[PDB]
Design a protein around this nucleic acid. Structure first.
Ligand SMILES: Nc1ccn([C@H]2CC[C@@H](COP(=O)(O)OP(=O)(O)OP(=O)(O)O)O2)c(=O)n1
Ligand SMILES: [Mg+2]
Ligand SMILES: [Zn+2]
Length: 453
RNA sequence: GGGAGAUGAGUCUCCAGGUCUCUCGGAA
RNA sequence: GAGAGAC
């Protein structure tokens, strides 16, 4: 993904898009009884903690495109995945605008707490000004659709979140591409049944884990991914997607029976315009972070990538023997034969992809490890590392949130086991706020977990 | 380093995506 | 009406 040009709004006639430059995060009452190195991310160019130029660090992820049209491997990969997908019998018909605004059984309503994006956010107009779940009204949506059209620019923001001190100094804060309400409804209408189909079938048919619940899914992954585990990580996945991969995604959607009108919307994601502060810019390639179905589309393309890298690197690969589950850029996979992931990364480089540093005892996925239950080793605990639970607990947007914050942390933390869950809890109970909280009890958590099966 | 508010240099406050999972509080 | 985490 690569910026083509940059132009000030004065010249592009664009409304200016500026959000906070101060974090809502501040140390909690637990900030000092727990260790951690994460601080809120740089929002402002003059952050005293910066050691790099802020904006050039922000946009250094747009590292360019290498390839614009599929080769034979990407084509075959895309046909393999597409053929695998046919058995889901995805409905290619357009979803109703009411369904796509207010949600179905397997696709949540458009989220009305967040911005309505360009131009709406800049006009002062909000999602709930236009959408109403009491009435289920689509009329006001039709109107603003007409008035403002589609393929509107994305609103670039900077994500206000905890990050590691190193990313703070490198200025590598996270850029958000806010979606216009119009493009969200339209993309959802085109692909909503596709979303519901994926959300409904986390696993190795979809090749995706969107919609998984780690508590039970984690026991399935060894059964789902037999053979030799290989995994790796991407650096800047979304931004390093060359157009070649959007061409491949369109072949999948065509193969699964989509009209050419629905397939056309993908080029609107390949090619995006963003307003950041008071300038606008073209981006060619790259998955815009906040479009509709990014995690579905990011996971679909990951299925294409892995397939394409295998058959281009190694002779004698049977793609039918590949097993893989993806969550956007995250990936766990297996194949009957062990895979040389360095050889893999060297051809990934030829496609403009950067992969970096495997059994069940070391694997991670959605940031959790795999820990067999000692009394029932076929049941797998997803293990959020305590070091990260510690990073979260040390900060707050709001002290009234403490009891709900700590309690979510406990539902992640206990999978690490009794001895570690009790260290965590007794550290919390060493300050008087912590002793006032209702803390879920370990045997209750384990008991309710086992009953899930 | 934009805009609005409160306040009278400054101080605080508001803006900030797509989805999934879990969970707290209201409802019939 | 909210939160927390994950991509
Ligand atoms: N608020 C967020 C955070 C992440 N993601 C998705 C987009 C890509 C991936 C980024 O994961 P990171 O937390 O940045 O971990 P990483 O892959 O190791 O680091 P990076 O993507 O910055 O290189 O998650 C997202 O859509 N929204
Ligand atoms: Mg990973
Ligand atoms: Zn353009």
């Amino acid at each position: 993904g690569e910026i083509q040009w940059v132009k000030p709004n004065k010249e592009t006639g664009r409304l200016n898009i500026n959000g906070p430059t101060r974090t809502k995060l501040e140390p909690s009452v637990f900030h000092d009884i727990f260790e951690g190195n994460k601080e809120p991310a740089v929002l402002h160019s003059k952050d005293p903690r910066l050691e790099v130029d802020f904006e050039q660090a922000l946009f250094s992820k747009y590292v360019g495109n290498t390839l614009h049209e599929p080769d034979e491997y990407i084509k075959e990969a895309a046909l393999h995945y597409a053929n695998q997908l046919k058995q889901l019998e995805i409905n290619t018909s357009q979803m109703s605008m009411e369904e796509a605004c207010y949600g179905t059984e397997n696709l949540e309503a458009i989220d009305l707490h967040t911005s309505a994006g360009y131009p709406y956010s800049a006009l002062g107009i909000k999602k709930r000004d236009i959408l109403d779940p009491t009435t289920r009204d689509v009329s006001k949506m039709k109107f603003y659709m007409d008035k403002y059209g589609l393929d509107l620019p994305y609103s670039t923001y900077v994500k206000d979140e905890l990050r590691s001190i190193d990313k703070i100094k490198k200025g590598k804060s996270r850029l958000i591409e806010a979606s216009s309400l119009n493009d969200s409804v339209y993309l959802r209408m085109a692909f909503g049944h596709l979303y519901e189909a994926f959300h409904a079938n986390p696993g190795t048919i979809t090749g995706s884990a969107v919609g998984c619940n780690p508590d039970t899914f984690w026991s399935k992954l060894p059964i789902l991914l037999p053979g030799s585990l290989f995994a790796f990580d991407y650096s800047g996945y979304d931004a390093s997607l060359s157009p070649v991969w959007f061409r491949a995604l369109e072949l999948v959607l065509r193969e699964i029976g989509y009209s050419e009108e629905a397939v056309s919307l993908i080029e609107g994601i390949n090619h995006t315009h963003h307003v950041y502060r008071n300038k606008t810019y073209c981006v060619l390639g790259g998955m815009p972070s906040g479009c509709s179905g990014t995690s579905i589309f990011n996971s679909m393309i990951n299925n294409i990538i892995i397939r394409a890298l295998l058959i281009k690197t190694f002779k004698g690969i049977d793609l039918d023997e590949l097993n893989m589950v993806a969550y956007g850029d995250d990936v766990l996979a297996s194949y009957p034969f062990p895979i040389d992931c360095l050889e893999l990364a060297k051809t990934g480089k030829e496609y403009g992809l950067t992969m970096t540093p495997v059994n069940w005892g070391n694997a991670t996925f959605l940031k959790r490890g795999f820990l067999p239950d000692e009394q029932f080793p076929f049941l797998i605990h997803p293990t959020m590392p305590m070091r990260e639970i510690h990073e979260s607990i040390r900060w707050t947007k709001d002290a009234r949130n403490t009891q709900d914050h700590v309690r979510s942390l406990c539902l992640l933390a206990w999978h690490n086991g009794k001895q570690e869950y009790e260290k965590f809890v007794s550290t919390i109970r060493s300050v008087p706020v912590g002793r006032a909280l209702a803390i879920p009890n370990y045997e209750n958590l384990r008991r309710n977990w086992l009953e899930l099966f």
